[PDB]
Design an enzyme around this catalytic site. Structure first.
Site, short mmCIF file in Angstrom:
data_model
loop_
_atom_site.label_atom_id
_atom_site.label_comp_id
_atom_site.label_asym_id
_atom_site.label_seq_id
_atom_site.Cartn_x
_atom_site.Cartn_y
_atom_site.Cartn_z
N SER A 1 53.43 31.61 54.61
CA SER A 1 54.76 31.54 54.00
C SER A 1 55.85 31.54 55.16
O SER A 1 56.67 30.71 55.04
CB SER A 1 55.21 32.58 53.05
OG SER A 1 54.20 32.30 52.07
N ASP B 1 46.74 38.13 44.38
CA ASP B 1 45.77 37.69 45.34
C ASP B 1 44.70 38.77 45.87
O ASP B 1 43.67 38.48 46.38
CB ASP B 1 46.36 37.07 46.74
CG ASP B 1 47.08 35.77 46.39
OD1 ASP B 1 46.62 34.96 46.72
OD2 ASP B 1 48.32 35.76 45.85
#
Lengths: 436, 432, 429, 431
Positions: free
Chosen positions: B23, B315
């Site tokens: 990211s 996650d």
């Protein structure tokens, strides 16, 4: 590389020149839009025509192309899916413009891109008339340049006056109006190639042909066809002129396209006094076809201009060569109104042919080609990456006493693979013809 | 032969640099292209996605120079983004697709986006509708929902946006589009979501306002060139953290890890379970929280995971599942693809001899359970399940075969190299 | 092409340097020759080692490689089959020379070719001795150049004496000896890289050694080993010299190979009075390995010559940099790639250093502060580019380092590791 | 893939078939050994013939090639240099065998390799004789498989006797005997393709034949020639046969080569009575070339075997189709690979024809009108697909042919030439 080219002792035999480019493009596009299977014979399978196929394959149409043979399982507009791929136009200006018309017809989203070169060719002249018909078209430089995005569908007919004359533009607007509602009319200053007009009718559509203005009624239905593609005149012209000039020659070019809007050379040849003949004239499209036969000729100078110029523009360099062996003076006039891409050709041919020993100079609106002159060789001449100069120069060499090195023959092998092969077997048959 | 045999670990000692944060890597490059001045990215993730982001911005006129993990982005504001003559190829990246859209809507020319097969099946309408409401002319396949998309970015008017879905990529797009709009642009959503775009953009000299559940940007501010030292991706870091926590005779330092709380959910679970964990050298690099974690073999206590946390650790559920097997007593996780994840995680651990069981909104793990090998365990082409199983095999007496290893090798190429390194250092320090 | 490099405020941290290229080659080769599975950790996955893997697969050995881990389903000599493909070596000098030895063992036909670069390097020094051992070898330029063709089989041990000092050569003959009849002995002028020796032993082969003379008896088995590849001191050296010189430096390099025929740099560092620690000495498969720790030291000029030169050749460019910061005159002599010395001199000189060349080597002088703001090229030689890079860490005003593609090809993560070291120093201070 | 073929309305026109494979290979090879430039026309630019070019380019020979036109700057044997690259033979059996010969001549090292295909074809029948001459040849399977390594030079001639008829093997040894000492001889039970002999004679080398034995002295000098490659009889066969069968047809085939060792179908055409013209009877680069003209003819069944069979082996598929329309007992008989002929029978009777299989050849009976409406496969073999294609020009209703993508490889424009004959009879048909 280069090709070294000797003088020919004679040229004899029969040749099939590769099929017309314009017709091959349209044979495919139209088959895709049609209902029932279309088959194509004599298909010119070059990068551009293969690009057309690839584009429609991405639109959903099942096309199988195997060398000069094509089969298009068309199911009309109703069987063109929205593409999940970018449509790659390659190098084809023809594909780009005509498919811009067709895609404006379709009730989904499409994107067009091509190569390096196609991204410098202005498209505004075609996007504008189409936005007028009710088509959402955006692209680089406000829709003037590649890439271009297109949503069409609910399209409306239009009368359209146009300043500059262009066959591709016309063809786009006509194909767009083919699914529109009402009168769609195109109007130009010059008359120009009628392949779109002619071939449409052979597929089962009606066009207007009104003087200087052509029109179409949407929405008509296109049916499957059996298209035998005529030979390209531009390629035939190289042999025709060779046959005329080279001593002891007798060449028969079969199945050549004779479309009056492109066969201007055939009028020039005749008035120069060529021993030219047509055989077996037919209409296979759409397009008129004939078997041309030429043999060594005594030529005379001919003034060429006006309405003729637009119909033989690709044969200007080869006519320049032809004129070298004609008595008196030939003139090309009204070339001033030609693209710089064509005005450059004229300028180079002038200088290339001079290197070869002819009396030829550039003028305000064309060239004057003076006297009958024996061409002397022992020099290098360049094709400048233009296949039309290479080929014209190549056949000009057939007359030169002493060898001629034509360079840049790569560009020829691209456009017309077997040009030299066909030439070689005319020299072989003529040598095999002289026996005791 | 797409399977690794993994033996139990006798110990795990060492330091490890996990790969950069995906990211942060994306955004460093993107916000770089929007700023005045040379941005210099360090520890950048040279994956396919991030390499795709670089490519699109090069195709937009931005000069960008990339070696291994080092990126340089040159100049030059919005004023230096030229109208592309190429199709912007998004590749596989969801992030490039979504964020660049926001940015593309901000530019007064024409752009096209396409990607590969995968991206050409992922619905974009969730982003394109908002941006169109800001003034953007965006068309595409399936009425602007599927790739390829075409973008014209007129003078943009701000928007007060509200969305039934919580999405960080969706939020990013609108905030970025809001960057060069006029008058405050605002996003509101059900849950609080990942905050990389706000933090980094803030570090790039921009001001974002935050009133819980609603974020807002006032256009149009300047961005300045930054030196961005990309923090370690925590999701990767998690696998070592958990292994280190469990395997006897272990001690792992992990250097320079993004510690951002919207993703550091595992760091709070470790604390709650009474893991021996240490933060050291905590600073902030270019908006992003970061520290080096150090973990040693722990005595873990079962814990309840649910509520706010879930988003911030989603996650890690597979690896947390394994962590749980070693904790004393029950540890509950609660609140389509998430349920398929849960099931196979449960499935595998079960044949390893754990007591785990699936529930409607998660799973329940019980007690400290010795794990056992002699079984072949599958990852069903999920790198997260693959690695999590890999770590669990480090605990099992008898060997464990882990099929579907090529998924791991794609996400984290040096993963087993890193494991091996810690396994060896522990045998070399075992010189008593 | 290039990188602009500023001076370093400090270098702190741990680094795992890449596997030793030489050990990495050999663990694949020996794995393939051995009974039982061999497994390889810390394997160096560069173009060359991968060429080695490429080749043995073409001989029929099942080899599965991922990043730094190899598996070799070794099944003995019985298990290598006659290639139907050409064995391609790409750019790999090691692979070519060694595989020649191996192929002289095998009773079938095989063909070796490489790229343009190998196609220029002569093979006579290996092909000639093996031909005298009984191997049928032909090729371009009477077996001196690729493509080479080989039929191996029944070999007879030779007592080889060479005027050249080459480990590839020694290895070829020793490898041919493995299946040769009786005793094969290599005697060389200097001593040289002994990785072939140490690893044959690790795989279970009895190798006898006086000084400079190594002998071997056919036809001993090899057993599948688990091999941990040690770090290249070759690479570790750039970081050790970096730590030694840059203020605020404390670098640890884990699992680094300390084999004495190649540890020449450590001898210098220690003689210069560097603050060097060698911790956790071990032997992994006959290979001495250790964790090194360096910190900013106050170095002294030392005289580097005689028997040491062979042990530190590849490190001459970096040691040259090291001597730049040492207090006093430091001499490198008895060296005779002599153009390689000269570029080191030229560049460093235009960097502000006080180096000159001699006929037997070079003379470097005193602690000279280095002035950047200038451009220096690697000249395609990667070692010059890395030496120059760490030299740059020391220089006021930035230094452009031309040809960082060569570096990037042989040590991809080299600049990232540097960054990571500079980064961690920022955090401490 | 597959192409659908309807019946033929009529076949009219002039067609130039592709160049002869065997002569195209040899033109380049011999030109590379010659002194002074060699210009080739009519070259077949196939995969195999381009492989020959590749190989000699790696031996130092400057060769320009563009579609059907090839230039070879010959500088004698002295101009060939030791290769630094592996010589890549692709898929070409001709290249492999004939180069092994040439390289045996050369005082340097050379390596040959090809595809998975060549890699499985035995070479011992060629390398063993070559070694007797003094050539050093090693390779996979003791010199019998690819890749093969060669060092040549000092060669002594041999009196060689083959128990197997092979043109390639003969060609190899002759080629080696071109730079050997004294008299090199080849003797084989039958006689086969003689292109090596003709071309070499045409390039200026003395080849002495005493029926059954060919012999060459060395070293003689090769001289650069102008070489107009004749059309391939094997491919002209498919148009002669179609012409003889289709109602109202008259086809001229320009510059077809008429080598008696392969003009077997032409003897079969005149023995079946078929009207067949033969204009422009000339010899070109040592090869006898003619212009063939066939019209629609009445076919009579004929016995074929022994004497004339070895020199028409490939044409058997196409001759089997020619017999479908011939009145009476028409039989071929000789087994000496032959698995091709097995498949021809299955498909033809499927069309509704009278063919059984016999111990060596097959029986064909009467004139049978073929019915169409079924799928016929060629099993990737081009000689079938072509014969099967031209067969379908008699039966009506779609006669789907498979393996067409293998036809488009050995003959790119086959279906184009075919199509051009149908549609030029559409235009010859106007009162």
């Amino acid at each position: 590389n280069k090709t070294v080219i000797p003088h020919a002792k004679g040229l004899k035999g029969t040749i099939k020149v590769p099929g017309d480019k314009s017709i091959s493009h349209r044979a495919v596009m139209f088959g895709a839009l049609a209902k029932g299977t279309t088959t194509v014979e004599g298909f010119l399978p070059g990068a551009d025509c293969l690009s057309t196929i690839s584009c429609f394959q991405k639109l959903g149409v099942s096309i199988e192309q195997a060398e000069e043979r094509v089969t298009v399982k068309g199911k009309g507009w109703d069987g063109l899916r929205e593409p999940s791929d970018i449509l790659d136009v390659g190098n084809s200006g023809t594909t780009t413009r005509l498919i811009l018309g067709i895609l404006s017809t379709l009730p989904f989203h499409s994107v067009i891109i091509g190569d390096e070169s196609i991204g410098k060719r202005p498209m505004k002249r075609v996007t504008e008339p189409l936005k007028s018909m009710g088509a959402q078209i955006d692209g680089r430089d406000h829709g003037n340049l590649t890439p271009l995005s297109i949503r069409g569908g609910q399209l409306k007919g239009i009368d359209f006056h146009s300043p500059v004359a262009s066959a591709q533009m016309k063809s786009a607007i006509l194909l767009a109006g083919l699914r529109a509602e009402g009168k769609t009319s195109v109007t130009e200053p010059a008359k120009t190639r009628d392949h779109t007009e002619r071939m449409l009718e052979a597929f089962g559509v009606n066009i207007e042909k009104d003087g200087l203005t052509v029109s179409i009624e949407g929405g008509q239905m296109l049916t499957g066809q059996h298209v035998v593609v005529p030979g390209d005149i531009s390629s035939a012209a190289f042999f025709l002129v060779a046959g005329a000039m080279v001593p002891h020659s007798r060449i028969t070019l079969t199945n050549v396209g004779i479309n009056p809007t492109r066969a201007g050379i055939l009028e020039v040849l005749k008035q120069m006094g060529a021993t030219l003949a047509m055989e077996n004239e037919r209409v296979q499209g759409g397009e008129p076809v004939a078997d041309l036969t030429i043999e060594t000729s005594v030529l005379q100078g001919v003034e060429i201009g006006g309405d003729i110029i637009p119909r033989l523009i690709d044969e200007i360099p080869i006519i320049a060569v032809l004129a070298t062996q004609a008595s008196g003076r030939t003139v090309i006039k009204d070339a001033e109104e030609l693209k710089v891409k064509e005005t450059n050709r004229i300028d180079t041919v002038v200088s290339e042919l001079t290197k070869l020993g002819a009396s030829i100079h550039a003028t305000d609106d064309g060239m004057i080609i003076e006297g009958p002159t024996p061409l002397k060789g022992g020099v290098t001449v360049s094709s400048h990456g233009d296949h039309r100069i290479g080929m014209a120069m190549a056949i000009a060499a057939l007359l030169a006493e002493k060898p001629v090195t034509v360079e840049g023959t790569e560009a020829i092998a691209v456009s017309y693979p077997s040009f030299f092969d066909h030439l070689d077997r005319l020299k072989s048959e003529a040598e095999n013809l002289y026996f005791q």
